[PDB]
């Protein structure tokens, strides 16, 4: 029913140089209530390559997903592949079961036109929501990733993409999710679809229609969310928003103010939260460096490097990928956090083995795996 905010800046004092301050906003949902008033838009690829276990498992998972969504929500279902086909628009689930059962495989993949249609449908109404997308191959209408960069996605609509198999374009889906504060799930086995797709249903939330505005006297740059302002349809689990802000030399005063607004999903009340980053000028270097939260600097750098890692594997720069994961290891071990240390081992782990195999087959695989993991680490649990 509510949201709590802890906001931390890396620097307490400024000094003689332009400084790259980094900040973290931790948003915690409290006493979570049933999620209602959301518009789920499902985009299912039914191309020829989908024939078999992939599409039957997707159909069953879709029905289970519809079962899991609470009742006060609207559902749209699209099937795209040779042409876009709307099964239902802004409706309820009972309509779809019979139609889901008649889905057939066949045709190319027209992801661009399906996304355009999903955007139009989302923009037909004033509800936040989600775009649940499953595909197993590249788009055949628009394979250029830059085109998916330029789309005007609906605000407060998070894209949950399920990339199936070894033939889709992980970089394109990453662009989609990055532009929509979304999540990319790599699915290597169709089995995974049956347990994973229903989890994209949001049952209980701490806030609805969240708006994070950042009023700064200097340039502000978010790491893992579009904005500022950040427009999140809902808060289901802890949100960590990372960003950078240029602290000018010898600055003193109110550097930035973060205003968070949201709707109580139960009381339907507008709550507004306000945090101030007040900085002073340091008159000594030891006095300036003691004002640095080095753990936050290391955490921000860690996630920066992880984003770079996804990009580098997408670019086949395995050498830089190795150097990057190594730095992530050093950061994890410097923070003495078991969770980060293992996560980084598991990744270095894979990168070294791919360098062993030294084939596009394997590089392209771990690219998918790690590209998904980046989005998951940066925008959930």
């Amino acid at each position: 029913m509510t949201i709590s905010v802890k906001a931390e800046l890396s620097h307490k004092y400024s000094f003689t140089s332009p400084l790259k301050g980094v900040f973290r906003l931790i948003i915690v949902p409290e006493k979570v209530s049933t999620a209602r008033g959301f518009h789920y838009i499902i985009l299912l690829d039914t191309s020829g390559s989908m024939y078999g276990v992939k599409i039957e498992t997707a159909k069953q998972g879709a029905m289970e997903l519809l079962s899991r969504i609470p009742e006060g929500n609207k559902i749209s279902f699209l099937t795209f592949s040779n042409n876009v086909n709307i099964l239902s628009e802004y409706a309820d689930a009972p309509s779809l079961v019979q139609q889901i059962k008649q889905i057939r495989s066949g045709g190319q993949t027209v992801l661009y036109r399906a996304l355009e249609r999903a955007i139009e449908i989302a923009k037909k109404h004033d509800l936040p929501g989600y775009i649940i997308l499953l595909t197993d191959g590249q788009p055949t209408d628009v394979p250029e990733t830059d085109a998916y960069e330029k789309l005007n996605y609906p605000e407060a609509y998070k894209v949950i993409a399920f990339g199936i198999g070894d033939d889709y374009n992980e970089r394109l889906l990453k662009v989609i999710t990055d532009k929509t504060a979304g999540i990319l799930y790599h699915v290597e086995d169709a089995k995974e679809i049956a347990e994973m797709l229903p989890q994209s249903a949001v049952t209980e939330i701490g806030a609805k229609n969240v708006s994070i505005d950042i009023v700064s006297e200097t340039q502000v740059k978010l790491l893992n969310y579009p904005g500022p302002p950040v427009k999140l349809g809902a808060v289901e689990s802890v949100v960590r928003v990372y960003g950078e802000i240029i602290i000018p030399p010898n600055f003193t005063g109110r550097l930035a103010t973060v205003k968070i607004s949201y709707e109580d999903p139960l009381s339907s009340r507008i709550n507004r939260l306000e945090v101030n980053f007040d900085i002073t000028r340091a008159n000594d270097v030891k006095r300036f460096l003691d004002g640095i939260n080095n753990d936050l600097v290391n955490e921000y750098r860690y996630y920066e490097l992880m984003s770079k890692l996804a990009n580098q594997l997408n670019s086949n720069n395995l050498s830089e990928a190795t150097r990057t994961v190594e730095q992530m290891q050093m950061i994890a071990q410097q923070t003495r956090r078991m969770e980060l240390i293992e996560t980084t081992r598991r990744i270095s782990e894979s990168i070294e083995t791919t360098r062993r195999i030294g084939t596009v087959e394997q590089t392209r695989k771990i690219s998918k795996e790690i590209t998904s993991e980046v989005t998951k680490k940066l925008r959930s649990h």
Partner: peptide, 27 residues
């Protein structure tokens, strides 16, 4: 040698980074 040192802190900062990672000072 092809790295750069930060003056405010004492970190050896790669020419890859324009800002110091330990302290945030500009190149």
């Amino acid at each position: 040698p092809s790295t750069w040192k930060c003056n405010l802190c004492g970190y050896e900062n790669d020419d890859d980074a324009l800002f110091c990672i330990k302290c945030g000072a500009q190149k």
